[PDB]
Symmetry: C2
Subunit: 330 residues, 2 copies
């Protein structure tokens, strides 16, 4: 038997409860590949799936965790054999299916990627969906003409999970990074990832009546959304793009069409969940090459399965800095 | 001396009046190239500059008209000489600078493009800023993977200027074009341009509480904006893109970020005004090749300078179908 985080729900009442529990192999859903999980992580979505559910989990009891990395235990699929190191992000694992907060996980072989060269299973989850999303965002900006030397790139929610990898990848590629945070004590941490400028959240988290402001940002990785994304749109330089990745600041988008029409701005939707295999390999290769491992190490916060109920709650309130690494075998 | 439409402003009350007037060459602002204008047209913005101004005109008296085409009369720039057929769209002509609603116009040589192969000056203005914008929208969707055979492409405000041209281009390139209109009597016109479905404005002109609806549209050219654009974002297929082109339905964009995050949807800003020389040539070549001239002809509504006050009022109310062609020399 083995350890896993299990969420139960009281349907009469609707309340949920998450606890570490012992399971057997036969309690897992059947699948092509069985992985002995070595590491997982905590994303904002995991926070939802650990606690309230946010309408993302449709079957209880539930093992959350949208990410994991580990070693293949058994497989009925040619692509993977016992011993192979593999990473799982997204594919609705941790939401529609049992996920990574477990010493063992069963998945479809289509959902896995080989462990990328230059990362171990621990760093792969230090990156996680948050870091993978950050790389997809940077790639979207590059595909739309972003190159260093044409103004600061804004990174909202910069001290969080997506923001910390975004900041470090962009800094390492040679960009000037303007890191947004509502908590000024995070400045030294952000500067140590490579932030050049620190923007206060309260400068930029309300809409204003003017549909256009002074052109400032050469690009943006938006891990916040909400009113702040609406306000940010009116401050992008002509022809610059914003990569939308986050909704912690709220799902609503109180924007105007004026930045798009008058300044040729783009709002680019970043989805990590359903990324095709080939693009997953490309983004992971870019992370291997463009995210300095010592910068990733400075983000890492260790945790066990027992910590997950507290960490899940904390990340929903924006009180988790950097990237949590869950040693499911600790 | 020669004829032009002049708008006067009564800055006390703030109300304007437009009328045909006789100018001399010396009344025109100085510039590098003098063009004997042959044709202009009526864009939504021209309606603003003809009438109330919409914050776009900062010096009266004002000759409006953001577009014109004709023959170079004199030139102090080596790029153009007497006799060259030239086309003007945008560059803030008709807004910041006296425009095409005149038998003669002075411009910077930087603002002109040679008359494109396959169009005469009349057809260039039947296309106009509106059609130029529609091609840029089609090009933006292509650059993001739009290709025939994967669903209908929505064109909002289909019976207007941008919408008519976009419809005909997309239909000629082999797409199924879903054409939005509030005027059901215009179905036969839209079918004649190549629309394969007619969609009623009232089905899609309000937001709904759900942030995602069923995936329908392979892409969109949006000449309306406002609530309709917010509603359309939630109906786009995974990874599909919207080319934002218009604001006749309102400048406010009451959207959510959910389509961008969950479906990888893009909102691509189309700016015609400041497009660089090289891309203008590319887009005009595409128009000459992919807008069938007989479809363009079916859009044409003839007009003279004296028609401009009424048409300017008409286009602001959504009461102009197709594309006006102004013979400034009739
Ligand atoms: Br923030
Ligand atoms: Br419409």
């Amino acid at each position: 038997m083995f350890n896993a985080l299990v969420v139960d729900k009281d349907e009469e009442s609707g309340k949920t409860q998450a606890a570490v529990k012992q399971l057997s192999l036969t309690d897992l859903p059947v699948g092509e590949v069985t992985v002995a999980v070595e590491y997982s992580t905590v994303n904002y979505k995991d926070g939802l799936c650990i606690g309230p559910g946010g309408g993302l989990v449709r079957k209880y009891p539930h093992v959350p965790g949208i990410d994991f990395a580990g070693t293949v235990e058994n497989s009925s699929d040619e692509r993977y054999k016992p011993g192979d190191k593999v990473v799982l992000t997204g594919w609705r694992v941790g939401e529609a299916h049992w996920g990574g907060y477990s010493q063992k996980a069963n998945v479809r072989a289509d959902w896995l990627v080989p462990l990328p060269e230059g990362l171990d299973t621990r760093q792969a989850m230090a990156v996680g969906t948050a870091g993978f999303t950050a790389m997809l965002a940077v790639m979207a900006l590059e595909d739309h003409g972003l190159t260093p030397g044409h103004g600061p790139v804004l990174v909202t929610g910069a001290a969080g999970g997506v923001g910390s990898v975004a900041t470090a990848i962009l800094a390492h590629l040679g960009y000037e990074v303007a890191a947004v945070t509502g908590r000024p004590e995070t400045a030294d941490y952000l500067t140590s990832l490579g932030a050049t400028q620190i923007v206060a959240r309260d400068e930029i988290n309300e809409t204003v009546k003017r549909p256009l402001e002074s052109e400032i940002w050469a690009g943006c990785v938006d891990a916040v959304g909400g009113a702040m994304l609406a306000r940010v749109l009116g401050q992008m330089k002509y022809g610059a793009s914003v990569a939308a990745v986050g909704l912690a600041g709220g799902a609503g988008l109180p924007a105007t069409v004026i930045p798009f029409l008058l300044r040729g701005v783009n709002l680019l939707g970043i989805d990590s969940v359903m990324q095709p295999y080939a693009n997953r390999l490309r983004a992971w290769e870019r992370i291997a090459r463009d995210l300095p491992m010592d910068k990733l190490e400075a983000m890492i916060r260790p945790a066990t399965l027992s910590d997950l109920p507290g960490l899940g709650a904390d990340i929903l309130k924006g009180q988790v800095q950097g990237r949590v690494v869950v040693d499911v075998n600790a």
